[PDB]
Amino acid sequence: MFRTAVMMAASLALTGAVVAHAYYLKHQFYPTVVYLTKSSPSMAVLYIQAFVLVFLLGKVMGKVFFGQLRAAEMEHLLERSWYAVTETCLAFTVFRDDFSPRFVALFTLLLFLKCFHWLAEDRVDFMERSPNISWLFHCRIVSLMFLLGILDFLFVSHAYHSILTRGASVQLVFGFEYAILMTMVLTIFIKYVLHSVDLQSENPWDNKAVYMLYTELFTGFIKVLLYMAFMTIMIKVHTFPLFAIRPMYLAMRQFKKAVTDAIMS
Amino acid sequence: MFRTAVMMAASLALTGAVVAHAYYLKHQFYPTVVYLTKSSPSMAVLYIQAFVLVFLLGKVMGKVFFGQLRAAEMEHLLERSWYAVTETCLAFTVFRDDFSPRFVALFTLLLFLKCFHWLAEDRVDFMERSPNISWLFHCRIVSLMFLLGILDFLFVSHAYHSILTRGASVQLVFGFEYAILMTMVLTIFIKYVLHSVDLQSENPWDNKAVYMLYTELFTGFIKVLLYMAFMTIMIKVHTFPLFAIRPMYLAMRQFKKAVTDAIMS
């Protein structure tokens, strides 16, 4: 993590230089802050420092929960992160609410949770074959599962309250994304308990593995249903969705492959 | 191509039904067309029919120039097509010029040419190893090269004239994208002539292959230079680019890998 430490040190030095420049421009306490908030490049450097701190926190949390593993997990993280960044910015333009740093923070937190969900899926796929099974692995998995579930439930409840009170303007995107994340967490829990039952039973117990596949396909159906409902509401409210069309196609393709595999089997 | 024929027949039937409904609503010639252009779903069906016709023309052109080959070429086409669609819609939001079907047609033509460029790159990579070398292969390659070069030169000249006369509002995006496509066509021409020299000389003639690699890296440098210039102008005109950041990162990563490979060699 030498490169991460170097990057965070560089960002900290840059923000310290910006703060020092502002302070030496206005010796008081209020005008320096108002100049920082009025000048654009200084606020941009502050945003970069905030993003770097978020990245450091994400690295710490990933080391605590999963721990390194530096593999296709990282490649999937990068690919889905680029896709999610494109989708998020698209959905942001989808509405006139530009800038709005609180909404930017909300989107960043959503991206944080989505990246952690993808890493959880990759760790589940690694666990299904031949992991370093121990007490700590189970503890990490259950702790991450409970944390993600609690946070997702709280945020979806807040989104439901917001859309009931204010309306379906921008909070519905968060609601649907966190609903998809809840489906992902349900799939993760099902896969983990199935693998635990398979491991604790010594014998392969294949009669349940097919059932696990059944559960998987059912969950996929649920997911695609949610997505199509999203599409419906997104054509009911505004003109035409643009941000989620590619994820819709991906979900449709995955469900089609799953149902074809189930039929041929 | 059974599925493509079925899809085009379905789209043609749908547009015929829309036309018949409009005609039976207004028996004249002018009000039916004005109702089609005023109603949104009918114009959407017309747009879908236009896209399907464009897809059929693209299939015909691909069969004429490359010919099937149904491989990683198609996978790269799909991936880069999703990426380019996201980038194009992002660039469209980048400006207040919404709808504007002529600009939509221009973007569609740009996507058409970019997809054909990617297929040309994939065919070059296939040709470099062990293709079905013959007169027809050379004819196809040179014809596609000349067509792409002529079209790119004409469109970049038109973009230069537009930005000189009107200004850098939306035509600069087309100019930079077609400049990147021109660099791609230059790389394709260099690779093709290098492979032709390698094949016609019987002996491997490795002393030039390294030179070919040199040319490749040089072209990559040119590409990244163009991209950074794009970034500069895009921060000079408007607030902050959003559409091309991921392609910028991809180009930077490719150039970094190329320069590291050149240094270690």
Side-chain angles (χ1 to χ4, degrees):
Chain A
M1 56 184 301
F2 172 79
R3 50 184 179 274
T4 65
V6 169
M7 182 183 60
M8 65 84 60
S11 181
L12 195 152
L14 189 55
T15 194
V18 166
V19 166
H21 153 65
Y23 178 88
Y24 291 158
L25 190 60
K26 318 293 179 58
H27 279 200
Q28 212 71 21
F29 340 100
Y30 173 97
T32 167
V33 181
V34 83
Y35 176 68
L36 286 178
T37 61
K38 186 178 302 301
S39 57
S40 30
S42 59
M43 204 58 180
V45 174
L46 295 180
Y47 290 157
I48 292 182
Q49 169 66 21
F51 285 168
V52 169
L53 180 57
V54 169
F55 192 96
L56 179 138
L57 180 62
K59 289 297 299 181
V60 171
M61 296 304 297
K63 203 271 181 178
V64 168
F65 285 159
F66 316 109
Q68 204 187 348
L69 190 142
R70 291 287 63 76
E73 149 185 338
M74 166 59 182
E75 315 163 357
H76 298 167
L77 204 178
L78 183 59
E79 299 173 4
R80 268 76 84 87
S81 179
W82 285 339
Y83 279 116
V85 163
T86 55
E87 296 156 24
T88 44
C89 170
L90 194 25
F92 193 75
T93 59
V94 158
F95 311 110
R96 300 178 182 178
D97 187 13
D98 53 354
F99 299 152
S100 66
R102 302 295 87 178
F103 290 82
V104 174
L106 295 178
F107 275 146
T108 297
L109 187 61
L110 171 60
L111 180 55
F112 184 91
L113 270 318
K114 290 176 60 180
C115 292
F116 249 81
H117 288 323
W118 295 324
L119 299 202
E121 294 185 3
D122 296 329
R123 277 281 279 184
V124 163
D125 115 77
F126 256 80
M127 175 208 312
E128 192 179 5
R129 298 163 45 184
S130 62
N132 185 20
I133 43 183
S134 55
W135 309 80
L136 56 93
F137 194 13
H138 282 176
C139 293
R140 293 162 180 263
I141 291 303
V142 301
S143 301
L144 178 62
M145 162 61 55
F146 122 88
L147 218 295
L148 298 174
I150 293 301
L151 258 57
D152 201 333
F153 202 3
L154 292 179
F155 212 93
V156 72
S157 61
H158 184 275
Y160 199 7
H161 127 80
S162 302
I163 63 179
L164 287 182
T165 53
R166 299 300 182 272
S169 301
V170 78
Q171 195 79 355
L172 73 164
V173 181
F174 286 84
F176 278 96
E177 296 303 325
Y178 280 96
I180 299 298
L181 300 188
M182 243 297 182
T183 59
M184 294 179 178
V185 107
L186 289 176
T187 58
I188 292 309
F189 209 171
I190 293 299
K191 293 176 182 178
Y192 169 69
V193 300
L194 262 294
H195 180 65
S196 302
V197 170
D198 185 15
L199 182 62
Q200 68 91 10
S201 61
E202 175 67 24
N203 55 262
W205 192 254
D206 55 79
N207 290 19
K208 198 62 179 299
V210 284
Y211 286 156
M212 173 184 62
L213 302 179
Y214 193 5
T215 60
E216 175 269 348
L217 66 87
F218 189 79
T219 56
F221 150 76
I222 303 178
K223 182 180 302 178
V224 71
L225 177 58
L226 292 187
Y227 248 101
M228 67 85 60
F230 197 6
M231 182 179 180
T232 301
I233 198 176
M234 199 42 67
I235 75 180
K236 183 179 180 299
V237 178
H238 92 304
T239 156
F240 179 70
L242 294 167
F243 50 91
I245 48 184
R246 198 220 321 103
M248 287 172 190
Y249 195 96
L250 293 176
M252 287 286 299
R253 178 177 176 268
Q254 180 269 353
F255 177 73
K256 185 67 62 178
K257 185 175 183 178
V259 67
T260 50
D261 179 67
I263 291 179
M264 66 88 59
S265 178
Chain B
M1 56 184 301
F2 172 79
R3 50 184 179 274
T4 65
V6 169
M7 182 183 60
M8 65 84 60
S11 181
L12 195 152
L14 189 55
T15 194
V18 166
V19 166
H21 153 65
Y23 178 88
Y24 291 158
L25 190 60
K26 318 293 179 58
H27 279 200
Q28 212 71 21
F29 340 100
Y30 173 97
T32 167
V33 181
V34 83
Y35 176 68
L36 286 178
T37 61
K38 186 178 302 301
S39 57
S40 30
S42 59
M43 204 58 180
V45 174
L46 295 180
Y47 290 157
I48 292 182
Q49 169 66 21
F51 285 168
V52 169
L53 180 56
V54 169
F55 192 96
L56 179 138
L57 180 62
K59 289 297 299 181
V60 171
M61 297 304 297
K63 203 271 181 178
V64 168
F65 285 159
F66 316 109
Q68 204 188 348
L69 190 142
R70 291 286 63 75
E73 149 185 338
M74 166 59 182
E75 315 163 357
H76 298 167
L77 204 178
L78 183 59
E79 299 173 4
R80 268 76 84 87
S81 179
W82 285 339
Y83 279 116
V85 163
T86 55
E87 296 156 24
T88 43
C89 182
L90 197 25
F92 201 68
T93 189
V94 164
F95 311 110
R96 300 178 182 178
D97 187 12
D98 53 354
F99 299 152
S100 66
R102 302 295 87 178
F103 290 82
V104 174
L106 295 178
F107 275 146
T108 297
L109 187 61
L110 171 60
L111 180 55
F112 184 91
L113 270 318
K114 290 176 60 180
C115 292
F116 248 81
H117 288 323
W118 295 324
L119 299 202
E121 295 185 3
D122 296 329
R123 277 281 279 184
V124 163
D125 115 77
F126 256 80
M127 175 209 312
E128 192 179 5
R129 298 163 45 184
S130 62
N132 185 20
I133 43 183
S134 55
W135 309 80
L136 56 93
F137 194 13
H138 282 176
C139 293
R140 293 162 180 263
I141 291 303
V142 301
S143 301
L144 178 62
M145 162 61 54
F146 122 88
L147 218 295
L148 298 174
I150 292 301
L151 258 57
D152 201 333
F153 202 3
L154 292 179
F155 212 93
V156 72
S157 61
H158 184 276
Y160 199 7
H161 127 80
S162 302
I163 64 179
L164 287 182
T165 53
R166 299 300 182 272
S169 301
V170 78
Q171 195 79 355
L172 73 164
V173 181
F174 286 84
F176 278 96
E177 296 303 325
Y178 280 96
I180 299 298
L181 300 188
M182 243 297 182
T183 59
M184 294 179 178
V185 107
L186 289 176
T187 58
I188 292 309
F189 209 171
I190 293 299
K191 293 177 182 178
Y192 169 69
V193 300
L194 262 294
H195 180 65
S196 302
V197 170
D198 185 15
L199 182 62
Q200 68 91 10
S201 61
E202 175 67 24
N203 55 261
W205 192 254
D206 55 79
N207 290 19
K208 198 62 179 299
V210 284
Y211 286 156
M212 173 184 62
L213 302 179
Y214 193 5
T215 60
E216 175 269 348
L217 66 87
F218 189 79
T219 56
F221 150 76
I222 303 178
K223 182 180 301 178
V224 71
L225 177 58
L226 292 187
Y227 248 101
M228 67 85 60
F230 197 6
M231 182 179 180
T232 301
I233 198 176
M234 199 42 67
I235 75 180
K236 183 179 179 299
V237 178
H238 92 304
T239 156
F240 179 70
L242 294 167
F243 50 91
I245 48 184
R246 198 220 321 103
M248 287 172 190
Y249 195 95
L250 293 176
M252 287 286 299
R253 178 177 176 268
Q254 180 269 353
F255 177 73
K256 185 68 62 178
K257 185 175 183 178
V259 67
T260 50
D261 179 67
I263 291 179
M264 66 87 59
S265 178

